[PDB]
Amino acid sequence: AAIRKKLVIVGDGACGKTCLLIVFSKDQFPEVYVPTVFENYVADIEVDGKQVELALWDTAGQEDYDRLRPLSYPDTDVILMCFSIDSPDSLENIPEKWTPEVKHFCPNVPIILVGNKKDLRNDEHTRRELAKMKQEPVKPEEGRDMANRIGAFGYMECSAKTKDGVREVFEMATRAALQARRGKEGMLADFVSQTSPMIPSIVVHCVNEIEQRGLTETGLYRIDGCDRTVKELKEKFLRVKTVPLLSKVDDIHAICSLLKDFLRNLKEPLLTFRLNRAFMEAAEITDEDNSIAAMYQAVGELPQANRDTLAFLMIHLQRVAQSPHTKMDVANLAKVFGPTIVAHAVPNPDPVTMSQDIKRQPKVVERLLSLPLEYWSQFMMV
């Protein structure tokens, strides 16, 4: 019988985690632009005379899944912690976000630091784009240095697109696994404007900034900004009370992350605890006409502040989906916003409940985003 090992992959959204797992397990490079929520794969590998069956646990890199991701950590044998060579920001998040999370939930589990998209290091288009932000591709020595800094078992670079170095990543992860076991915010109402349309200033400002500087950017809302930058912006907002000067933030993705963070951390979700189940049930109705009618009914039950803020957000997200540059259609946006605006029916649900809710959240957002622009616009009085 083969030796079984559990491998969990983590890292910033869109840094290449799924493509790496699929190229290795299926020998085929996925061409679609779709964010992962949670998926499981199986791959075989022969290492040091042993046949090993690797269970590959794919996860979402978005901050929106910070509360749900830990459900994947129990019994992990090795972690693949990734960043992309064409994204210095994704490397910055390795010691700032990923290492603290993994060491908390997976103490003593070996970590392989992986630099993805190696094929882009000398890509001129990539270099020109990074230069606009005064950046450049990550250098090999930087990856190795970071690996030593975080106590990783090793560092490996690869390109799922060219297949270069892919098996080596899993060979090292498998050896690490074998060696390690050898011999062993208040309520929304407190932030909104005085009357209809009742929306928080931070939401209006973020949306306006994003529509001004982000509709031509690939992966809006899928790509998170530097964890530190978002934390600083959030800290200032809640302390100074006024919205920070967003025009001074060079990375528009950080503004997207700020908006999602604000919404996700409200005392209760945008759709409220009281209607959480009603929304999920309405979206789960098989018959489209009946589902749509049930969703209109649920929206009509929301408090004014929640309805107006939701309407403003839906109009904005429809524009994001309609842009030919973002590659973020309704289905993609629903996957990212599910935990952020739907969330759960209680403050601290148990793991069983958290898991049960996962599949139900995106459906709610997809249904809401599919409601007519004319419908949402009435609440904006335009």
Q: Which does 332 bind (CB under 5 to 8 A by kind): Mg ion, ligand GDP, none?
A: none
Binding mask 77-116 for ligand GDP (x = CB under 6 A): ---------------------------------------x
Pairing of strands 38-47, 78-84: unpaired
Q: How far is the CB of 219 from ligand GDP (least distance, A)?
A: 8
Look up tokens 């997200």; give the residue: 317
Tell which positions 147-186 bind ligand GDP, by CB under 6 A: 159-161
Q: Binding residue per annotation — 34?
A: yes
Q: Which does 244 bind (CB under 5 to 8 A by kind): ligand GDP, Mg ion, none?
A: none
Say whether the peptide bond before residue 324 is cis (omega within 30 degrees of 0): no
Q: What sign does the dihedral 253-258-261-262 (CA atoms) show? A: negative
Look up tokens 């490397």; give the residue: 91
**Does residue 59 belong to the site contacting ligand GDP (CB under 6 A)?**
no
**Does residue 18 belong to the site contacting ligand GDP (CB under 6 A)?**
yes
Q: Give the C-alpha distances (Å, rounded to integers) separating 2 from 44, 112, 158, 183.
A: 9, 22, 26, 18
Q: Which does 15 bind (CB under 5 to 8 A by kind): Mg ion, ligand GDP, none?
A: ligand GDP
Comparison of 21 and 255: residue with beta carbon closer to ligand GDP: 21
Q: How far is the CB of 38 from ligand GDP (least distance, A)?
A: 12
Q: Give the C-alpha distances (Å, rounded to integers) separating 154 from 78, 102, 175, 349.
A: 12, 16, 11, 37
Binding mask 8-37 for Mg ion (x = CB under 5 A): ---------xx-----------------x-
The closest alpha carbon to 311, from 233, 377, 242, belongs to 377
Comparison of 227 and 268: residue with beta carbon closer to ligand GDP: 227
With 0-12 / 13-18 / 19 or more C-beta atoms within 10 angstroms meaning exposed / middle / buried, residue 25 is middle
Q: How far is the CB of 231 from ligand GDP (least distance, A)?
A: 22
| End-to-end Cα, the chain, rounded Å | 67
The closest alpha carbon to 260, from 162, 372, 151, 336, belongs to 336
Q: Binding residue per annotation — 159?
A: yes
**Does residue 87 belong to the site contacting Mg ion (CB under 5 A)?**
no
Residues 116 and 16 sit within 8 Å (Cβ to Cβ):
yes
Count CB neighbours of 99 within 10 A: 19
Q: Which does 13 bind (CB under 5 to 8 A by kind): ligand GDP, Mg ion, none?
A: ligand GDP
Q: How far is the CB of 34 from ligand GDP (least distance, A)?
A: 7
Comparison of 36 and 201: residue with beta carbon closer to ligand GDP: 36
Q: Which residues make up the interface to ligand GDP (CB under 6 A)?
A: 13-19, 33, 35-36, 61, 116-117, 119-120, 159-161
Q: Which residues make up the interface to Mg ion (CB under 5 A)?
A: 17-18, 36
